[PDB]
């Protein structure tokens, strides 16, 4: 399922003279793009029935696990887009199973139990860095990936949820960019050699942190607004939502202007060879100061904010990155003229 064929080669795209790159939408284009984005967002928002089903899946799993293995305080939690305000009705369900009982981290035992209780397409990856069980629930009609005790993923999901809660523009902008990535088939870091949705979300956040004035702060740096978590530890990132809300309100750019600027930033402004995007810091880092010029698959460097050693761009080789950059050029060209529908056309192999 390789998205970017090896024929593309690996050449970097040349930087275009900044004076020759459109920097502003015309009023007519902005007005129509705003309306078209708002219509698309309304269609992408989730519906009650499916949001309820996501919760029902959590409860069903928790009951099954505590009946099979009682006395181990097994709890089940949504994460990913089901927990960060960025899901649509067709989004998969990311689930984290927490327990002090480390025996449960051998996930083949979970697969066997779920197969016994009517889940379908039950498969597992026991030797991955994060072992997972995948299922299809035929009653709730949900595809689910679950892990055991990956509490970092609960926290980075909660971080994304906090960013979404800080400024009204984040949810529609991110939901629309995510839709673009699905239609263009550039959000498949396993099969396709492109980037995970989480990676794209971090890129959206990093872009918004770099607006003038910024739309989003650097939550990991706002120490005085960190609250204590349910587990009793101080949060790694600022999370006092009432005190953070409004941070970006001084930036008055519309959703249309922000979508145009997102594609302009990634298509033309950002120097991929030199810099690492860091939502932990809210400022650009250099690859060189992280020794990231040596990483395999380092054409795009997007630092995971909880593990400064993980490049979220590491699933894109140089060929795939070339194709991704070309897709960003294409999107910039089209959004510049308000062509949202064409920008989001389904890619066909
Ligand atoms: N490198 C990574 C990749 C993923 N994760 C964790 O997995 C979740 C789902 O990834 P995801 O890519 O499915 C993001 P989501 O908003 O759910 O997208 P979707 O609606 O298109 O399904 C993220 O929210 C992170 O908690 C991580 O910790 N490190
Ligand atoms: Ca997901």
Numbering used by the authors: 248 to 596
Task: Provide passages from the article that reported this PDB entry.
Template-independent terminal ribonucleotide transferases (TENTs) catalyze the addition of nucleotide monophosphates to the 3′-end of RNA molecules regulating their fate. TENTs include poly(U) polymerases (PUPs) with a subgroup of 3′ CUCU-tagging enzymes, such as CutA in Aspergillus nidulans. CutA preferentially incorporates cytosines, processively polymerizes only adenosines and does not incorporate or extend guanosines. Here, we report structures of the catalytic core of T. terrestris CutA (TtCutA) in the apo form and its complexes with a non-hydrolyzable CTP analog and A3 RNA.
We first obtained crystals of CutA in complex with a non-hydrolyzable CTP analogue (CMPCPP). The structure was solved by molecular replacement using the apo structure and refined to 1.45 Å resolution with an Rfree of 18.1%. In the CutA-CMPCPP structure, one Ca2+ ion was observed, coordinated by side chains of both aspartates, and non-bridging oxygens of all three phosphates of the incoming nucleotide. It corresponds to metal ion B in the canonical two-metal ion mechanism of polymerases. However, it was not visible in our electron density maps and most likely absent because of the chemical modification of CMPCPP. The contacts that stabilize the incoming nucleotide in the CutA-CMPCPP structure include binding of the γ phosphate by Lys425, Ser328 and Ser444. The side chain of Tyr445 is located between the ribose ring and base of the incoming nucleotide, stabilizing it through van der Waals interactions. The 2′-OH group of the nucleotide forms a network of hydrogen bonds with Asn403 and Thr404 side chains, thus ensuring preference for incoming ribonucleotides over deoxyribonucleotides. The strongest contact may be the hydrogen bond between the O2 carbonyl of the base and side chain of Asn403. Moreover, Arg557 is located 3.3 Å from 4-NH2 of the cytosine, potentially forming a weak polar interaction.
